[PDB]
């Protein structure tokens, strides 16, 4: 009664939205959704192992790749256990568990200890080999030593949770109202997975602040034939589309929707925002439409060769390959043959007349005989397809979520962002996907941390979906535990402190930054640290890192038009061996949602390349959107742009080679940096060509002192950046060939073909990226299909990509120059 007052108040602040608010609704779905999610929360809180929940050991069951096996000498791993002062190095075999490693220590010198990593709140514990922890693999990858602190297991009490009809369907369009303002009409559609079943327009009246029709619109479709999730899509045109809004004809309690509705509309090729049951909360300025609904609840033969081959041909096509009327009818007639092929499912369930009850019944009868689907090896791409906008049946979407259950927590992180955005395609608030995210979020602190920030990011900058995500986020926070509630509170404060500074500082816009503006920043960062700021906080992009006090000397405003903040924190962990500060960039103004999605696809391409033992050394530096147009980015130490290397605005060839030569002390190291360059450049060439973001200016491409190339901004045409200065490191020039350039070619083709083996996964994540993260036509989605050379053999595709390399060779500097040329 009394204790709930402050706690709900608290939850609102972490969310950035009041989930008890009733100002922008016309039914109790969101409240029923809150009350519904209590069950899966309390089960997962009850079921989770309290010891391992606190430890959150970051583990994988995948094979350790062939490249990291070469780094291992003779079945031996050096691990350095530390006391408060002294430390000893242990020889360990990759197969050894935390337990077996702890037996070796006690013998050398009660088991109430755990091998915590130095500098980070990350642990080595549980029935897992030392090779199967992700932190150990990071050390082997980067060539770092493995440093550990023998200390106390953290008390699980810190993670404690608080207590608690054959008639036709019709709609009356009364009229439209707008406070402030050609002809105008209203188009009422009946939608199921953005497939228009039924459509009726009104008569075109003149456009004014009030336009009334009072017309019954009788549709073709009957009441009984309406499927669950069917979406009454009201739209206002004037030739051109101005406003839109949606209403679910069958509600969360399976009841037919009836009564008067004054729905406030959104304002302006398809987008994830167009599907939302959310009405516009800005009632002061928005367009409005009035409707009345007065209408009850929702309740063995040999196939020919040629048709079998015709059917198998249809299953073999990519997701974006459209099914004709003929293709669908074939898939349906032979649905029991189709059902034996898991890859058919998206096409099969796309080939269903969802506006007929008898057919949907048969579709549900078909989903019962699911032996092959349940037994099938998990395909994530195929699963993602069944959660996109094209599918809106609950039971269909459920079988996709069923396959996701088997994923490791390591795999959930790889797809978490895209799975969070997939919630936008759910017809109803409460869903199998939402519950899966919550359930896997509560089971694992790391997933839960990144879940919090993914939901909070959307809540801050999506009026279309903030209501939905908030209810989910409130449900996570109600079971995450006191420890994590405190951590999120400390993080949310720090971001709120820094959001104010960056907003005020920018006002004080010519590209050159003033000297006193830096001193003004340092004045405010003195002020912040003294009074309001918390002593430490978890780094949102890397929650293992505990960033403490703030190094005011090294902080500055960065020489850009958008004036981001170069920030630099001292580490909070005393066991931290390195004295190097935690560099963080904090930017404002840009919309990071789009780029954050592209980075997650880049992280996915790494894991594809890992499974085929290729280490292309991409950099997906920590990059989290922390709120409305603001986010924290990891500062890669020892890194600079190409443009600063060049301009030190002319163009030169030999400079990039000299920059590595000088910055590398020993000549033997320089070649390892050249090796790192050739891999990274190959990786960044392939990936940018696939995503269609290769044509880029030098300033947005960076390079480490250790030779690692990477990109920091995403958008005669060039397919990708392979300019002369890159090639001068590689050896070739003009019309010649070199050994490193042939190695570059070998990695690019092996990289390109590797990605082509997961063509469907890449296509669907690309398709989803454009729908969920943008203010998009089929032409836009159709690029990646052409870029991946769909339906073509490997030798044909090798030829394709090697020509794109030669296109960059033929043009050379021609495209780089045009940045400056078009500027005036």
Tell me the binding residues for ATP: 583-592, 618-626, 710-715
- Compute the least distance from the CB of residue 626 to ligand V84, in Å: 10
**Location of structure tokens 């109790």:** 28
How far apart CA 88 and CA 105 sit, in angstroms, is 9
- Compute the least distance from the CB of residue 510 to ligand V84, in Å: 16
Which residue's CB is nearer to ligand V84, number 96 or number 595? 595
How far apart CA 248 and CA 493 sit, in angstroms, is 38
Which residue's CB is nearer to ligand V84, number 130 or number 601? 601
The string of DSSP letters for 132-182 reads GBHHHHHHHHHT--EEEEEEPPPPGGGG-------SEEEEEEEEEE-S---
**Location of structure tokens 């034996």:** 340
b/e 508-540 (16+ beta carbons within 10 angstroms → b): eeeeebeeeeeebbeebbeebeeeebeebbbbb
- Compute the least distance from the CB of residue 335 to ligand V84, in Å: 44
- Compute the least distance from the CB of residue 623 to ligand V84, in Å: 5
Which residue's CB is nearer to ligand V84, number 232 or number 623? 623
- Compute the least distance from the CB of residue 720 to ligand V84, in Å: 17
- Number of Cβ within a 10 Å radius of residue 236: 23
* Secondary structure of 756-778 in HEC code, one letter for each residue: HCCHHHHHHHHHHHHHHCCCCCH
- Number of Cβ within a 10 Å radius of residue 134: 15
How far apart CA 157 and CA 824 sit, in angstroms, is 64
Which residue's CB is nearer to ligand V84, number 10 or number 560? 560
Collapsed DSSP state (helix, strand, coil) of residue 483: helix
Q: After which residues do gaps appear in the chain, with C to N over 2.5 Å?
A: 109, 164, 181, 238, 268, 295, 299, 508, 648, 715, 775
HSE on the CB side for 411, CA within 13 Å?
Answer: 14
The string of DSSP letters for 79-110 reads EEEE-SS-EEEEEE-TT--HHHHHHHHHHH--
Which residue's CB is nearer to ligand V84, number 560 or number 742? 560
How far, in Å, are 284, 455, 477 from residue 485 at the CA level? 35, 15, 7
Strands lying side by side in the sheet with 210-222: 210-222, 168-177, 288-293, 259-264
- Compute the least distance from the CB of residue 644 to ligand V84, in Å: 7
Which residue's CB is nearer to ligand V84, number 557 or number 614? 557
DSSP conformation class of 473: H
Collapsed DSSP state (helix, strand, coil) of residue 232: strand
Which residue's CB is nearer to ligand V84, number 178 or number 617? 617
Beta bridge partners of 236: 186, 243
How far apart CA 607 and CA 823 sit, in angstroms, is 39
Which residue's CB is nearer to ligand V84, number 123 or number 586? 586
**Location of structure tokens 């996964």:** 761
How far apart CA 150 and CA 595 sit, in angstroms, is 40
Which residue's CB is nearer to ligand V84, number 92 or number 565? 565
Which residue's CB is nearer to ligand V84, number 561 or number 735? 561
Token digits of residue 547? 């960033």
- Compute the least distance from the CB of residue 704 to ligand V84, in Å: 8
Which residue's CB is nearer to ligand V84, number 560 or number 738? 560
**Location of structure tokens 């894991």:** 607
Closest-CA residue to 602 (of 517, 665, 675, 687): 687
Which residue's CB is nearer to ligand V84, number 505 or number 754? 505
How far apart CA 135 and CA 148 sit, in angstroms, is 11
Contacts of 179 (CB under 8 A, 6+ apart): 209, 284, 285
Angle of the 394-404 helix axis to the 357-368 helix axis, nearest 10: 20
Contacts 24+ apart (CB under 8 A), 263-268: 263/26, 263/234, 263/288, 263/289, 263/290, 263/291, 264/24, 264/288, 265/234, 265/236, 265/289, 266/464, 267/242, 267/243, 268/241, 268/242, 268/243, 268/244
Distance between first and last Cα of the chain: 66
- Compute the least distance from the CB of residue 820 to ligand V84, in Å: 17
- Compute the least distance from the CB of residue 638 to ligand V84, in Å: 8
Which residue's CB is nearer to ligand V84, number 137 or number 587? 587
- Compute the least distance from the CB of residue 747 to ligand V84, in Å: 24
- Compute the least distance from the CB of residue 505 to ligand V84, in Å: 16
Closest-CA residue to 371 (of 399, 410, 351): 399
Q: Binding site: what residues are annotated?
A: 583-592, 618-626, 710-715
Q: What is the dihedral of CA 567, 571, 572, 575, to 10 degrees?
A: 170
Q: Are 426 and 397 in contact (CB under 8 A)?
A: yes
Locate the DSSP E strands across 465-599.
537-539, 542-550, 556-557, 565-571, 582-588
Q: Which residues bind ligand V84 (CB under 6 A)?
A: 558, 560, 564, 585, 587, 590, 592, 595-596, 621, 623, 631, 633-636, 639, 641, 712-714
Which residue's CB is nearer to ligand V84, number 394 or number 590? 590
- Compute the least distance from the CB of residue 118 to ligand V84, in Å: 23
- Compute the least distance from the CB of residue 225 to ligand V84, in Å: 46
Q: Are 557 and 516 in contact (CB under 8 A)?
A: no
Which residue's CB is nearer to ligand V84, number 517 or number 639? 639
């Amino acid at each position: 009664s009394e204790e709930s007052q402050a706690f709900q108040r608290q939850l609102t602040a972490l969310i950035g939205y009041d989930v008890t608010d009733v100002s922008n609704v016309h039914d109790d779905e969101l409240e029923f959704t809150r009350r519904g999610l209590v069950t899966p929360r309390m089960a997962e809180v009850a079921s989770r192992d309290p010891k391992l929940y606190a430890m959150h050991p970051w583990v994988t069951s995948k094979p350790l790749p062939e490249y990291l096996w070469k780094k291992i000498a003779n079945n031996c791993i050096f691990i350095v256990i530390h006391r408060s002062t002294t430390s000893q190095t242990i020889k360990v075999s990759p197969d050894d568990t935390p337990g077996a490693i702890l037996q070796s220590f006690f013998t050398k010198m009660e088991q109430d200890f755990v091998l915590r990593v130095c500098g980070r709140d990350e642990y080595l514990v549980g029935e897992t080999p030392i090779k199967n922890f992700q932190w150990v693999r990071h050390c082997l990858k980067n060539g770092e030593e493995i440093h550990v602190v023998l200390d106390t297991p953290p008390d699980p009490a810190l993670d404690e949770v608080r207590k608690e009809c054959d008639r036709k369907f019709r709609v009356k369009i009364r009229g439209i109202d707008i406070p402030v303002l050609l002809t105008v009409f209203v188009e009422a559609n009946i939608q199921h997975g953005q497939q228009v079943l039924c459509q009726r327009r009104t008569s075109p009246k003149p456009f004014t602040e009030e336009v009334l029709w009072n017309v019954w619109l009788e549709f073709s479709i009957k009441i009984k034939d309406l499927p669950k999730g069917a979406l009454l899509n009201l739209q206002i045109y004037c030739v051109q589309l101005l406003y839109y809004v949606n209403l679910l004809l069958i509600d969360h309690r399976f009841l037919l929707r009836r009564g008067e509705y004054v729905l406030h509309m959104w304002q302006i090729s398809f987008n994830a925002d167009k599907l939302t049951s959310a009405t516009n909360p800005d009632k002061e300025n928005s367009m409005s439409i009035s409707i009345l609904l007065d209408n009850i609840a929702l309740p063995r033969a040999e196939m020919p060769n040629q048709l079998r081959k015709q059917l198998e041909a249809i299953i073999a096509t990519d997701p974006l390959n459209p099914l004709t009327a003929e293709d669908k009818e074939l898939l349906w007639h032979f649905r029991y043959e189709s059902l034996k092929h898991p890859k058919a499912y998206p096409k099969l369930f796309s080939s269903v007349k969802w506006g007929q009850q008898e057919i949907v019944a048969k579709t549900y009868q078909l989903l019962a005989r699911r032996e092959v689907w349940d037994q099938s090896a998990l395909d994530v791409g195929l699963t993602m397809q069944l959660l996109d906008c094209n599918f809106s049946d609950e039971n269909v979407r459920a079988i996709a979520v069923q396959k996701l259950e088997s994923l490791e927590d390591d795999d959930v992180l790889h797809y978490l962002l895209q799975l969070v955005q997939a919630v936008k395609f759910e017809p109803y608030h409460d869903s199998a996907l939402a519950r899966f995210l919550l359930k896997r979020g509560l089971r694992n602190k790391r997933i839960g941390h990144f879940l919090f920030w993914f939901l909070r990011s959307e809540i801050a900058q999506s009026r279309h979906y903030q209501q939905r995500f908030a209810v989910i986020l409130e449900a996570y926070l109600r079971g995450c535990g006191t420890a994590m509630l405190h951590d999120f509170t400390q993080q949310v404060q720090v971001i709120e402190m820094l959001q104010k500074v960056t907003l005020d500082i920018k006002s004080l816009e010519k590209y050159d930054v003033s000297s006193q503006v830096i001193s003004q920043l340092k004045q405010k960062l003195e002020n912040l640290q003294n009074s309001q700021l918390p002593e430490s906080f978890r780094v949102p992009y890397d929650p293992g890192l505990k960033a403490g006090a703030l190094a005011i000397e090294k902080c500055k405003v960065m020489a850009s038009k958008k004036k981001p903040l170069w920030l630099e924190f001292k580490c909070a962990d005393p066991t931290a061996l390195s004295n190097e500060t935690i560099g963080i960039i904090f930017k404002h103004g840009d919309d990071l949602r789009q780029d954050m999605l592209i980075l997650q696809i880049l992280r996915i391409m790494e894991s594809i390349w890992e499974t085929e033992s290729l280490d292309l050394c991409l950099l997906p530096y920590g990059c989290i959107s922390t709120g409305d147009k603001i986010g924290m980015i990891e500062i890669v130490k020892d890194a600079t742009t190409i443009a600063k290397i060049q301009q030190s605005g002319a163009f030169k060839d030999e400079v990039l080679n000299h920059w590595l030569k000088e910055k590398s002390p020993t000549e033997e190291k320089f070649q390892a940096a050249v090796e790192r360059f050739v891999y990274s450049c190959a990786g960044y060439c392939v990936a940018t060509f696939v995503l269609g973001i290769g044509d880029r200016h030098n300033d947005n491409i960076m390079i480490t002192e250790t030779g690692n190339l990477f990109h920091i901004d995403f958008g005669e045409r060039v397919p990708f950046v392979l300019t002369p200065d890159f090639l001068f490191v590689m050896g070739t020039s003009g019309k010649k060939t070199s050994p490193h350039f042939q190695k570059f070619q070998d990695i690019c083709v092996k990289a390109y073909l590797a990605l082509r083996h997961h063509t469907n996964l890449l296509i669907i994540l690309f398709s989803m990226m454009l729908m969920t993260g943008m203010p998009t036509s089929k032409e836009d989605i159709e690029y990646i299909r052409d870029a991946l050379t769909v339906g073509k053999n490997e030798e044909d595709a090798k030829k394709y990509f090697l020509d794109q390399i030669e296109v960059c060779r033929d043009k050379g500097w021609t495209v780089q120059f045009n940045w400056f040329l078009h500027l005036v």
